[PDB]
Design a protein around this nucleic acid. Structure first.
Ligand SMILES: [Zn+2]
Lengths: 76, 31, 39, 125, 167, 44, 256, 40
RNA sequence: CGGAAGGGCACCACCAGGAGUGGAGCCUGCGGCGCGCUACACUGACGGAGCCAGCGAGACCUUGGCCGAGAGGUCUUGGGAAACUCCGUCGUGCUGGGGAUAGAGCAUUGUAAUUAUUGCUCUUCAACGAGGAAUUCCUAGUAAGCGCAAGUCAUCAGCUUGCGUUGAUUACGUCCCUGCCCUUUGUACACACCGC
């Protein structure tokens, strides 16, 4: 409503130390939250799979249970 | 020991500030 | 695995062409989908 | 097909899969003969069921054992459990049940943990 | 599907997951302008409009000319005429009013006597008429329809809403 | 009865069906035991 | 039997969800309760009916100091038995305790002889509380002073306010023995002072005028930092409450 | 600077006197929580 | 307020044993107190050979090839632990157990102060000769021995926590002692027993 543009200025983000450029790309918060979301998804699916393997119930019967290199490839 | 004392001091000052602002907004609403 | 077949010339480079065109179209489709997701 | 029968021996953490079929009379463990088991003292602990019951049945029977898991003593006990289970299973299946019962009686009068597993589960006081 | 089984499957659901017909816009419409409405106007009459005109003593043709400052042809459908006839003996004056050599009637092909749906469909299909009314439901539906002038009766004479050239 | 018919394994029959001097066939005493003789010496 | 345990843990999860929803409904209905004018589920099924039995057990290859401390906790509780876990896996341990029929487990962990962690588990798929216990002082650490009186002790709980405090006081209450005598001699105190609960044994006699207490037993401040729904075998069960350390108000928030 | 967690409280004579006085009050009142036996 | 009688329990008791702490060295929590680890050798040390697991899956680890005694470095690929078993050397001597300390050398890492650290080779071979007064813990896959992995909000990094491997001697009775507890109105319902 009542705000100067210099008040609305901009704030740039500084970069990795040039002496420490072996380890690259100093990570900020947007990258951190992307990484954390992907790791949370992996942990969720892994917990699901561990729960299912804990409740396998080993009497399940499904009917599907009744079943040179280029020269080698061409021959096969 | 210094950590303990500093936490105590910060909590005391925060409580005093909260009481002061509650009193100010009370005076605003009643005056 | 695929079927090992032997190719001569024009048919080989034509399959290279159709792979190129598929890759172009996949990139453009993904970019348009991302733009629509942002919108 | 060829008459075959598969059994499992299980000590502490030693699994022993045993395939038994008719054949020339060979007893092989992990691709080696049974006369070359590892600890060189418990070789008789693994000969125990053969010498208990006699050697003619094993002259008729082919046996292949493979073993995974567990230390040395645990593996030897799993091998002998798998051999006794396989032999009495083959005898129950493809020859007379009277000889099955005679074998079961001889083995369980010598040592019952030949056949059935001794899972030493805990207990509180 | 037990209730405990339902709860278990919902918990596993959360953990796992974590021809057509598009009617063309009329060629009469710059974005909301409706540039096919130039005088003399054609105005669709409704029953409540006739009755409130009788109540406030404004003439239809001449009061409408006083509103729009142009000649207006009022048109009455068969659905509206049937609603008047079914209202009947207490609105005999409204019926003799709507039956007139200048009120050019226009037919319809509808199974029913829903004047609101008749008028809404007319205006959806053509967008050359302006609608005359005083009813709130029809007002809201036509206000949602884009680019159609609404003309209500109110106060001492008619009022017109969605026309650009009101004056 | 209906629930035992449904959930049981073996055959179960219908339970029952639902003046004058009456006889009770089942007697919860050997029929030559007097009531005073059945009463204990502590409870009297 | 594995199908039994799976079915029962699923029903237990549903029952805890229902109890949470009904407790929120009770918090809603409490506003009406002041206009006109209780224990947990497992401890309700076995509140005062059956007396509990606990197994206090070491972590693994414990030092002599930790074994002394485990014996001290065994002497603090009534109906306790001491258990030396050596080469017991955790599934077989809780399986043997379930099979034996045991009300609860208390496993201890130390650091170079100084106890620091204590986890309690209620056994029919009950909750596990993980406490960090800091300021340990043992009777062995003090002196040859005699022996614990071992009578069915009285209980004292100070400054337990929130729903978390209610959960904790119910858990510890039902670890103790039910229905003590009126003139029961030793009293266990559970003081709460800013998330650091502290326990002490105290004997007391009523004097010619008042009371006079003697402090005995162990002496240590514990502090809860986890409360898991399933038993401690799982490490994948849902968490009912989890201590948050790297939050902004971490050094000011109480009962969190 | 600033800290991150509650400091573990050191036991002193004042707080242990306060605590034994609390227990004195509780016992003198004979009003303390116990797991009373279930009736019926 | 005190006693008596009857009864139960307990590796804070008895009984039978085992394994530690306290002696040396190293490490580490407390300010002298305490916890772990390695030793004091022949049920061993050393050299060859045999080989058997489980828990674990957020410029990196790597298979293979090269050279270097080793430590290591070099070029290429993708995203199977120890104790143990057998054969052999040594033999009772602080000896070859022990590896403190010291010297010399070789390589890696940071970096630039001839800086610090790590790993390897050779030489030097200290204390320790089975640990007083005392003290602790323990009854079965338990005590003890041996390694492997991971650091998943508290606690831990010469450490905590899991995991597998090898696996015993001795009680499993008694209230005699040292304690602790319960009862001294069957209250409850048959037979029996007891009867202030
Ligand atoms: Zn119509």
């Amino acid at each position: 409503k009542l705000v100067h543009d210099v008040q609305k200025k901009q704030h740039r983000e500084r970069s990795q130390l040039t002496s420490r450029s072996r380890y690259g790309f100093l990570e900020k918060h947007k990258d951190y939250v992307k990484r954390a979301q992907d790791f949370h998804r992996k942990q969720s699916t892994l917990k699901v799979l561990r729960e299912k393997a804990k409740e396998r119930n080993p009497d399940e019967y499904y009917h599907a249970m009744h079943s040179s290199m280029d020269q080698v490839k061409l021959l096969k | 020991f210094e950590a303990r004392q500093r936490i105590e001091e910060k909590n005391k000052e925060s409580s005093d500030y909260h009481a002061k602002m509650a009193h100010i907004v009370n005076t605003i609403n009643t005056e | 695995a695929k079927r090992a077949v032997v190719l001569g010339g024009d048919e080989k480079k034509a399959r290279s062409f159709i792979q190129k065109v598929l890759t172009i179209s996949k990139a453009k489709d993904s970019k348009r989908k991302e733009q629509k997701a942002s919108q | 097909a060829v008459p075959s029968v598969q059994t499992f021996g299980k000590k502490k953490s030693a699994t022993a899969v045993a395939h038994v079929k008719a054949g020339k009379g060979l007893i092989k463990v992990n691709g080696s003969p049974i006369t070359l088991v590892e600890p060189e003292i418990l070789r008789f602990k693994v000969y125990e069921p053969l010498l208990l019951v006699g050697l003619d049945k094993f002259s008729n029977i082919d046996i292949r054992v493979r073993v995974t898991g567990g230390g040395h003593v645990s593996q030897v006990y799993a091998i002998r459990q798998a051999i006794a289970k396989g032999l009495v299973a083959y005898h129950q299946k493809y020859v007379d049940e009277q000889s099955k019962n005679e074998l079961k009686k001889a083995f369980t009068s010598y040592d019952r943990t030949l056949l059935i597993a001794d899972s030493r589960r805990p207990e509180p006081k | 599907a037990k209730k405990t089984r339902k709860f278990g499957l919902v918990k596993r659901t959360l953990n796992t997951k974590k021809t057509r017909n598009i009617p063309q816009v009329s060629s009469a419409l710059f974005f909301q302008y409706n540039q096919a409405i130039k005088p003399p106007y054609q105005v669709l009459i409704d029953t409540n409009f006739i009755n409130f005109s009788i109540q406030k003593k404004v003439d239809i043709v001449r009061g409408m000319m006083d509103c729009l400052l142009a000649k207006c042809n009022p048109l009455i459908t068969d659905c509206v005429m049937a609603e008047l006839e079914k209202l009947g003996p207490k609105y005999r004056i409204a019926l003799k009013l709507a039956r007139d050599p200048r009120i050019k009637r226009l037919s319809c092909s509808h199974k029913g006597t829903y004047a609101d749906d008749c008028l809404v469909h007319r205006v959806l299909q053509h967008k050359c008429y302006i609608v005359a009314t005083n009813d709130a439901g029809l007002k809201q539906r036509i206000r949602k329809i884009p680019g159609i002038p609404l003309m209500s009766v109110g106060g001492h004479a008619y009022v017109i809403e969605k026309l650009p050239d009101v004056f | 009865y209906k629930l035992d018919v449904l959930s049981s394994v073996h055959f179960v029959p219908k339970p029952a069906s639902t003046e004058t001097p009456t006889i009770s066939m089942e007697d919860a005493q050997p029929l030559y035991m007097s009531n005073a003789s059945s009463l204990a010496p502590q409870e009297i | 039997m594995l199908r039994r345990q799976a079915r029962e843990r699923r029903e237990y999860l549903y029952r805890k969800a229902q109890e949470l929803q009904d407790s929120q409904l009770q918090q809603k209905r409490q506003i009406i309760k002041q206009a006109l004018a209780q224990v947990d589920d497992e401890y309700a099924a076995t509140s005062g009916i059956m007396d509990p039995r606990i197994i206090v057990t070491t972590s693994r290859d414990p030092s002599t100091r930790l074994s002394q401390f485990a014996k001290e906790i065994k002497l603090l509780f009534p109906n306790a038995v001491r258990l030396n876990r050596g080469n017991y896996v955790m599934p077989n341990l809780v399986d043997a305790c379930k099979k034996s029929g045991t009300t609860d487990l208390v496993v201890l962990h130390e650091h170079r002889g100084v106890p620091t962690s204590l986890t309690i588990s209620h056994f029919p798929h009950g909750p596990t509380a993980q406490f960090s216990l800091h300021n340990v002082v043992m009777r062995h650490d003090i002196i040859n002073a005699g022996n614990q009186s071992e009578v069915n002790p009285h209980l004292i709980f100070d400054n337990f306010t929130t729903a978390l405090g209610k959960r904790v006081v119910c858990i510890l209450k039902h670890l103790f023995n039910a229905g003590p005598k009126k003139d029961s001699e030793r009293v266990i105190t559970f003081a709460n002072r800013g998330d650091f609960i502290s326990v002490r044994q105290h004997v007391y006699v009523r004097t010619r005028e008042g009371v006079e207490i003697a402090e005995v037993g162990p002496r240590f401040e514990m502090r809860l930092f986890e409360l898991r729904l399933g038993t401690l075998e799982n490490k994948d069960a849902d968490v009912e409450w989890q201590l948050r350390r790297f939050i902004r108000t971490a050094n000011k928030k109480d009962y969190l | 600077f600033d800290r991150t967690a509650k400091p573990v409280p050191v036991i002193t004579s004042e707080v242990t006197e306060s605590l034994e006085d609390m227990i004195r009050r509780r016992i003198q009142d004979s009003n303390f929580d116990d797991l009373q036996r279930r009736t019926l």
